[PDB]
Amino acid sequence: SFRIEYDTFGELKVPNDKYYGAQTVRSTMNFKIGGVTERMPTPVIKAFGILKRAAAEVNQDYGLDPKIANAIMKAADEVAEGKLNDHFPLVVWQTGSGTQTNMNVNEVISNRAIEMLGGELGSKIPVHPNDHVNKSQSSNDTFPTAMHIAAAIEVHEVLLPGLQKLHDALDAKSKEFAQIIKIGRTHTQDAVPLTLGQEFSGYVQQVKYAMTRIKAAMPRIYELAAGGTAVGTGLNTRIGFAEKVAAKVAALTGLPFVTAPNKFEALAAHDALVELSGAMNTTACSLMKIANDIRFLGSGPRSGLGELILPENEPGSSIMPGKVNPTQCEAMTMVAAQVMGNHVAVTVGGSNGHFELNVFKPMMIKNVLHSARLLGDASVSFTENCVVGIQANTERINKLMNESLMLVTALNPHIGYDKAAKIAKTAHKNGSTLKETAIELGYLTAEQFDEWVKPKDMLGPK
Amino acid sequence: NSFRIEYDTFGELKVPNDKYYGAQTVRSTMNFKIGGVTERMPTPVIKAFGILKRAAAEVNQDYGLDPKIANAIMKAADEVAEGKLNDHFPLVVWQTGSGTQTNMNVNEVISNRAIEMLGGELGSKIPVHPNDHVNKSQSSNDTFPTAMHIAAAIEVHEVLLPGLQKLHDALDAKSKEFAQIIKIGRTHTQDAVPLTLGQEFSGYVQQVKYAMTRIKAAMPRIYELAAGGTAVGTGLNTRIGFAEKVAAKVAALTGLPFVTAPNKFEALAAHDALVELSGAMNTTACSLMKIANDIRFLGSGPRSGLGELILPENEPGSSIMPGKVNPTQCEAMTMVAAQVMGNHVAVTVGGSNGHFELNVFKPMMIKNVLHSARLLGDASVSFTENCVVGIQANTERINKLMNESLMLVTALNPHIYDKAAKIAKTAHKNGSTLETIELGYLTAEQFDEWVKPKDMLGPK
Amino acid sequence: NSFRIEYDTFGELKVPNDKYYGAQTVRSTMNFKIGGVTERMPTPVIKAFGILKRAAAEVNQDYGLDPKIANAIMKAADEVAEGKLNDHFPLVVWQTGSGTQTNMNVNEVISNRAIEMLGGELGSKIPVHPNDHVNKSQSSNDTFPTAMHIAAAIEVHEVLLPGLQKLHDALDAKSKEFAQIIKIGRTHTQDAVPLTLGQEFSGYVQQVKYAMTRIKAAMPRIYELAAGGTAVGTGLNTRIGFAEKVAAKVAALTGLPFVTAPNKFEALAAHDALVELSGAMNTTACSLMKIANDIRFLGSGPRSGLGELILPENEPGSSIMPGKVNPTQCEAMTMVAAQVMGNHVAVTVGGSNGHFELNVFKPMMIKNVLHSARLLGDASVSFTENCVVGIQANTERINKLMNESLMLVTALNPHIYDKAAKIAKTAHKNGSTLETIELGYLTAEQFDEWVKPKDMLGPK
Amino acid sequence: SFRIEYDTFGELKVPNDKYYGAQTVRSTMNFKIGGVTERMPTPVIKAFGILKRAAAEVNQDYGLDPKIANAIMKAADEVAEGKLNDHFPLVVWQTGSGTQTNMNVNEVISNRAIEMLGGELGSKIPVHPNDHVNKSQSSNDTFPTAMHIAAAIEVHEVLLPGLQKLHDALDAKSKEFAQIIKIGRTHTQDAVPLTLGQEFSGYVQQVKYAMTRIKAAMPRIYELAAGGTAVGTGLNTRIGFAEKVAAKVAALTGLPFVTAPNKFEALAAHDALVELSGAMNTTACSLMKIANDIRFLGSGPRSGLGELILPENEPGSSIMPGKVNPTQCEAMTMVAAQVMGNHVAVTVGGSNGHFELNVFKPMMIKNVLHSARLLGDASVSFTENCVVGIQANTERINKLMNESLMLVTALNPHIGYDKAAKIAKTAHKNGSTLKETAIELGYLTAEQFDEWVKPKDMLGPK
Ligand SMILES: N[C@H](CP(=O)(O)O)C(=O)O
Ligand SMILES: N[C@H](CP(=O)(O)O)C(=O)O
Ligand SMILES: N[C@H](CP(=O)(O)O)C(=O)O
Ligand SMILES: N[C@H](CP(=O)(O)O)C(=O)O
């Protein structure tokens, strides 16, 4: 059930049902940091598939045998399509260049291509991991290329679609709640009116701006390092390889990938991952506020604010009979907190480049992909399992709004804020309504108050 | 307008005649124009340098320093320590990472003030030489870390812990005062089962008690002083016993248990103790965020919020929303909490980036630690005196909110939770009281026996 | 010693006769004693308030404000904006989370200075009333955010970007100057293949160019002003057109493309644009950490380091290690970089903690954003003028380090990597040159043809 | 291959080969945030096993049938021993109280106990998830209890043993290198001498202090919330239950667990997790410095510092023939960066408690366990695969040290620092040695220099 491969350190049993070789087994022995939970994220593996596919096709221009190139392309496609995920056992906590994973990809594509050409697994015949699959490449330019492909795909496939669904659901609710006049709260204190639609329009703008911020952080993610080789010079690669590989990846993905104009900047730093993480960090601040507001507006049902009725997805507590909780708000705010921590991890990695290579690469892409996936998935879940089903408690909203002492703000231009403040202070002290306190105080008539104090008229400038 | 003329190996320098600093300091002001006066080395570091140079001058008498000179250095150093010469320190945090510029600034000011006391000429280095006398047996590499730990320890003992002690005592007083008031608990922000306002406040008391324990637990390695390590930690060109004598002198002058760092390489190459102390203040900030934010929300209204607490009014109300008054001390405290968390990340990045024999992020690290300690201390005093001590319970409102809670039916769980859930769901749907006799699970007399909030405050 | 007497609803207040602030400001100094003078509201916020109140006064003439009063408010506001009245702002960042105390401080100072210009009595609110005239059509809730964005935009355009532009141009000059010098690359800190010192520096140039692009990309939503939202964003008790006219007036006064925020609820309830701008400065800090740290290590020695660069000497050497000179500008820059990263976390925590219609972490958020922008700007100028422009290449040392590198045998990969690895391993073990003819893989003439560093700088 | 269970929302197919029930399947449908990578960490599941075992035994004092109690204890033990890991499919990104996981544990222990008593899976007969397995408990007090048990075990079993191995290996090297005189570097510049043993003693102290800091952060992790129930009052639990459960967990683990003196503090906040994360954050700063120093000291072999020879564990690069890299230093520094980010995630969660319950619990324990595991595993790997095999390049060290211009510091007390500075400046400008420059300058004789400038004599105070 094992074959035998060798490196300069000894012989290695390799499971016969695995496409990886001696370098990968050696790497599993040397980097036992975290369990299977710490394995290189799938999107990086798939991006390596896309990248090696592109390199194999392009390398035909620079002397790669079409028969071999074709088999490498088919094997690479299987990696990209997630058919060979079980042949990647290596953790994030490896070489800072992601060398072990590049070798893992080179070995798996080599042996799968060998199998397709009816060769012997482990023979490197006729497909050699270094001479064919890694031709014109280093880990130094391929791992960054895989990071940017993986990041771009996760943003377009998961993060932005998630935020789009949340935007559309919040906007629907904004329109639905456009007529409902509620009380504003500033410093958590009773303030002047606004519509529940107006409050929700704030959330809509925040999510719209989140998608703008993420798109604004993508242009330099579309720059691929492929062609820089060891130090960015492109030593032992051919003129045009960098441009052709980038164009091939753009064609394969339908995303506007281009070669990095400066390969030194592309290898020595991952400032684009720090930039993208920063956009997701801003998104996390927006989502924390939206989810926390909805949590508190839905609080009660009796001794909270109780302005919103949130959908019940789970049965109530057995220890507090029938009690139901804003559980999607909790999942979203926990994700928001995680993204903020991930961002600091990305920042520390990004700041610690040395000369020609930043060697924090696996850690940086792990945190960026984690944040993008969590934000995308949480946005869908928060939308489908909370936002779309939110109802307004119109009776309660109307009571809380009408009872607010700060409706006397409407009397500011009519009787001055000194007299308005006396009415509010007196009504508060007496447990009285504003109307009767103003009549008893003799600042206006019952008919004047009913003309000057209409919530419907306090929703815009005059 | 009045300037004297000093020289360094780079040229002549105009030095204001009314300043005790010299050529090294003026040169440093020309080379490090990063941030305005707001970015000047914090006063506690300057004062700690005063204490340290005072200790070194006295101790150096054992190692050949003229008592006449030593005495004048001690008097001038004491003036620095007492904050009499703060205007003679114009240098910013954003200087050499060893804090060399500030050490030289201290050496020059003490030198010229001592010269003045001995009737010499300012700028002459006669008879008190900044390097040969004031900096004798020392480097910036061991003195700046010594000043950091002295400054940090004094700020913790004089500002941070006294602030938290006042907050602890005020919260504990309120816990006792509110021990009889039964309110409704909130979990997930939802109506929960009863607890006393005293019980809720006892949580806050424990958090502040544990904050003080955490800060004290982070101090033992702050009491380790680098003084004696000189350039790289070997103690090259310093005398045997100097390290122990200077530490003992600082302990005697401050009444704090300062000792020489057992490993001077660890003391110069890293400031892990500042990262540790920042971490304690970071935990404290999480506790204070929770306490201040809870009190903010419990005080919300006065009508369309929770309105359980009445917070003292310290300012007149808004003119834009007439008479509106806000939990302003809660805002100051929660903004401070957020600042401490950011400061902690700055300290961590500095702490992680030591190179070989010297960490050269020293000024940035102590600035953030002193900022956090000062803000936490001052905010704790202000939050205590201007909010906590004056908090009142809205007993009428609390009683209504608690009695009306559907989750009082939890008391019926051991008596009759399936049936309890039906009562709560029905009462909720009907806008009825837990009347809902109608369901026929108990008599009016049984409900009055089985549902007493007074009995739901403990295990049985 | 000279005091006048003002009143609020809480009592009488002594106000220094030589101060333009009033009862609200003195009350605020009594209630918010958190940090010393170092924690005072940053000057750029005060100046931005000057610009904003100037704009409001002029625009308010359309909505019934007496031109005589309006004119005096405009002159007094201009003095605030020009930094003539900085001593009349004693309030700290750690106040109300809306920045209400500072808005009142601005309203009072402009009121009393305008009163003085019109020959009235200081403290009288006659004929210029702080609330009725200077604060007309406004709340703190929409004015403080407006001041934050004006202050942030001006600091970015006047300090941060000019600083990075100088650094970009200086690095680019050096890139061109060093375009012919072939050095050894380092990956994992290990000896790698050649690149030019110009190529390495072109990396730094791109990083700074992209930093300026990132900051500019983060500005569009900073140009959105909240002015017109008043209390909760509805614009209650303000006039139609006021929001657009005030934004257009600020744009005209500053020459920056300020516009009214399309959604005033988003503008009051959150400061996501400050979190976005802080994020751009956070990325910039990662770029500058790398550039400054690389130059620090490349300049290391002069004998037992890398010693590829000769950094300008700006200070005299150490007296403790005679003549020793250090990369002090690199230390100032990397300490600033670490500070920006911490500041960013403070901004993020504040930004995440909005409640309903108002985020009340406003002063803390703008303090951290302005701190980061100022430090990055000033450090970029200082690092440029006092280090980068004067950097020299040690061509003799660079040439030795590069020619002796075992990884020049990489050039032989396409000619003869198994054989290339044997040559490197043998030369290393023997302390020999790549002589190692002995292995017999090529002739002395073939090696001289196949191994030219000049040919290893590009793809073929 | 499926049985059928019901909740108030519909019928649910439950795989017959799974011990979880309707609440768990419902939770998998409602919380699709991240894949299997985001599943509740195993140590939390195992800690739930220990906790439910303790509760079942103790509950016999308060009316739980011994027959049932015994079966619950056996099933709980299987969870604790990691025999039933595949029956826990729920993610971290659930209810902030960890309610879904508590229910998952209650269901699995219920059905496994039912199976042991020959009952029908899904019947809740005779072992009821709520009435028996969750007896005297809430999620609010059990999830915090599981967090502290999991955290304490990870610290004692993984983190501290890892740091102990690193401490001992660094101390061995300190002793081994005690005679080797190298050049100190301050600001990265050539400084005065110290032994390689002295430099390594710095690292030893940092790791010793790391273990002290972690132990100093444990006392409040040993406080268990069990007994607080819903809000901390202990409503619907029995007097003595809190103390007995804590004592039982202490006995089962051999760790000094005690009941939290204040259950309000224990439910409303997780300040102890923030405290422990802070200790691991300080540890990360220490390990960043140690790993980065060793990386740079091992740099070359020719155009770096080259003072250390690091063990080769992998074959050299094929693109740069024979090039070998400090890969364990990279794994360690990437872990250090991750711990710093995790710490910010923990801090944000810890700061955001509301009234009687902090609902960031799963996110906080995930980050704490991640940091502890990574630090522990990286410490072992860095020790075994780098530190124990480090050699000194004595020839190179001796050259770099003897050539340093700052050996003239030894002449400070003999000829004053002004004359010493002239010698250094002149020798530098002339490319000369200190000795001959001092003779040519005429500040001392060849015999005086050889007496006054001995590196052996510059290693201590005089
Ligand atoms: N990691 C690369 C070499 P590779 O491309 O083999 O990963 C380096 O040493 O710089
Ligand atoms: N900064 C110190 C020496 P000093 O004591 O002069 O500050 C160094 O160069 O290592
Ligand atoms: N702070 C504002 C009002 P102001 O404009 O008085 O600052 C509020 O109470 O919402
Ligand atoms: N989560 C608890 C109830 P449970 O114990 O069922 O998890 C709450 O609502 O406070």
Side-chain angles (χ1 to χ4, degrees), chain B residues 108-354:
Chain B
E108 287 187 331
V109 166
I110 291 173
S111 160
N112 283 331
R113 176 50 178 149
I115 283 168
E116 192 184 50
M117 284 170 171
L118 295 172
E121 207 90 77
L122 294 183
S124 67
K125 316 174 203 173
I126 296 159
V128 188
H129 196 281
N131 297 339
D132 294 347
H133 301 137
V134 184
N135 206 56
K136 184 183 161 59
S137 314
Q138 300 160 68
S139 171
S140 309
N141 299 356
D142 64 347
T143 57
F144 197 86
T146 299
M148 294 200 290
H149 280 192
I150 290 164
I154 290 175
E155 206 72 3
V156 167
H157 286 284
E158 288 193 353
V159 182
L160 181 48
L161 286 171
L164 288 171
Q165 191 63 71
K166 282 187 174 57
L167 177 56
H168 170 271
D169 296 352
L171 286 167
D172 194 40
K174 288 291 146 167
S175 191
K176 291 168 187 184
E177 174 170 1
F178 300 154
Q180 307 303 317
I181 300 165
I182 306 176
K183 83 199 290 283
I184 205 61
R186 293 182 187 80
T187 66
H188 309 68
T189 74
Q190 296 291 79
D191 299 346
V193 293
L195 74 168
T196 67
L197 183 60
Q199 276 176 321
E200 186 174 64
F201 265 67
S202 75
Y204 309 153
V205 170
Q206 191 81 336
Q207 283 184 283
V208 178
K209 190 181 73 186
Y210 280 5
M212 295 182 73
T213 303
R214 285 170 176 126
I215 292 159
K216 283 168 177 184
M219 284 307 292
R221 287 154 292 280
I222 297 289
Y223 295 131
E224 295 183 15
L225 301 189
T230 60
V232 301
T234 54
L236 172 65
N237 287 346
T238 211
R239 302 304 316 283
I240 292 171
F242 178 81
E244 290 89 353
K245 287 173 184 186
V246 66
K249 186 59 66 184
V250 169
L253 288 164
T254 59
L256 295 176
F258 290 109
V259 299
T260 208
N263 193 301
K264 293 300 193 294
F265 306 103
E266 183 268 343
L268 265 55
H271 298 300
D272 297 344
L274 288 184
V275 180
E276 177 184 2
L277 177 52
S278 186
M281 291 191 291
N282 182 70
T283 308
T284 302
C286 290
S287 301
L288 292 185
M289 184 74 82
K290 153 68 178 197
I291 293 166
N293 194 66
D294 267 12
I295 285 163
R296 191 220 306 276
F297 271 91
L298 288 176
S300 63
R303 291 188 172 188
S304 311
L306 303 187
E308 293 187 5
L309 297 181
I310 303 302
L311 311 194
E313 304 186 7
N314 299 308
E315 294 89 40
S318 179
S319 61
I320 292 320
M321 284 179 286
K324 190 169 175 293
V325 290
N326 294 312
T328 63
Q329 293 295 323
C330 291
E331 288 162 18
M333 177 57 88
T334 54
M335 282 199 297
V336 158
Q339 189 64 65
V340 169
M341 294 169 194
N343 292 357
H344 180 61
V345 166
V347 171
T348 301
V349 172
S352 71
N353 276 317

Side-chain angles (χ1 to χ4, degrees), chain A residues 149-394 396-398 400-402:
Chain A
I149 290 163
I153 289 174
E154 206 71 9
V155 167
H156 286 284
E157 305 263 39
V158 182
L159 181 48
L160 286 170
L163 288 171
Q164 191 62 71
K165 282 185 173 194
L166 178 55
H167 169 271
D168 296 352
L170 286 167
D171 192 40
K173 288 291 146 168
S174 192
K175 293 168 193 314
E176 174 170 1
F177 300 154
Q179 307 303 317
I180 300 165
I181 307 180
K182 48 156 288 147
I183 203 63
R185 292 185 187 80
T186 67
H187 310 254
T188 74
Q189 297 292 80
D190 302 342
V192 293
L194 75 168
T195 68
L196 182 59
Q198 275 175 325
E199 186 172 65
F200 265 69
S201 76
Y203 310 152
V204 171
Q205 192 80 336
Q206 284 183 282
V207 179
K208 190 180 72 190
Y209 280 6
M211 295 182 72
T212 303
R213 285 171 176 126
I214 291 158
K215 282 167 183 164
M218 284 306 292
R220 287 154 292 278
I221 297 289
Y222 295 131
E223 296 183 13
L224 302 188
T229 59
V231 299
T233 54
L235 173 63
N236 288 345
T237 212
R238 302 305 315 283
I239 293 166
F241 178 81
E243 289 85 358
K244 287 173 185 187
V245 169
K248 187 57 66 182
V249 171
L252 287 164
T253 59
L255 295 177
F257 291 109
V258 300
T259 206
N262 192 300
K263 294 299 193 293
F264 306 105
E265 182 268 343
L267 265 55
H270 297 300
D271 298 342
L273 288 185
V274 179
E275 176 184 5
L276 176 53
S277 187
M280 291 192 290
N281 182 72
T282 307
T283 302
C285 290
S286 300
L287 292 184
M288 184 74 81
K289 152 68 181 173
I290 294 166
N292 194 68
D293 267 13
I294 285 163
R295 145 199 271 151
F296 270 88
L297 287 176
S299 62
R302 289 192 171 182
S303 307
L305 302 189
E307 293 192 0
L308 297 181
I309 300 161
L310 275 43
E312 305 183 8
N313 298 308
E314 292 89 39
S317 178
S318 61
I319 71 111
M320 284 180 286
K323 189 170 172 294
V324 289
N325 294 314
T327 62
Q328 293 294 322
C329 291
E330 289 162 19
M332 177 57 87
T333 54
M334 283 198 298
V335 158
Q338 188 65 65
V339 169
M340 294 171 195
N342 292 357
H343 180 61
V344 166
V346 172
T347 301
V348 173
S351 70
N352 276 317
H354 306 122
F355 314 114
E356 279 55 71
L357 202 63
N358 182 299
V359 287
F360 288 79
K361 301 194 199 298
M363 181 270 314
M364 288 181 73
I365 189 55
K366 162 62 182 168
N367 281 283
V368 164
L369 288 175
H370 192 221
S371 290
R373 180 67 134 87
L374 288 188
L375 284 176
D377 287 3
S379 290
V380 172
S381 183
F382 185 63
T383 295
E384 294 182 355
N385 298 325
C386 185
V387 174
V388 297
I390 290 182
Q391 299 170 24
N393 190 334
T394 52
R396 178 134 189 163
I397 284 161
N398 198 59
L400 289 164
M401 188 272 289
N402 281 312

Side-chain angles (χ1 to χ4, degrees), chain B residues 131 186 200 202 207 210 214 224 237 239 263 272 276 282 287 290 294 344 348 356-357 460, chain D residues 185 199 201 206 209 213 223 238-239 262 271 275 281 286 289 293 347 355-356 409 417:
Chain B
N131 297 339
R186 293 182 187 80
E200 186 174 64
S202 75
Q207 283 184 283
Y210 280 5
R214 285 170 176 126
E224 295 183 15
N237 287 346
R239 302 304 316 283
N263 193 301
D272 297 344
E276 177 184 2
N282 182 70
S287 301
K290 153 68 178 197
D294 267 12
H344 180 61
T348 301
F356 314 116
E357 279 55 71
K460 296 300 163 203
Chain D
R185 292 185 187 80
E199 186 172 65
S201 76
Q206 284 183 282
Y209 280 6
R213 285 171 176 126
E223 296 183 13
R238 302 305 315 283
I239 293 166
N262 192 300
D271 298 342
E275 176 184 5
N281 182 72
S286 300
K289 152 68 181 173
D293 267 13
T347 301
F355 314 114
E356 279 55 71
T409 301
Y417 68 73

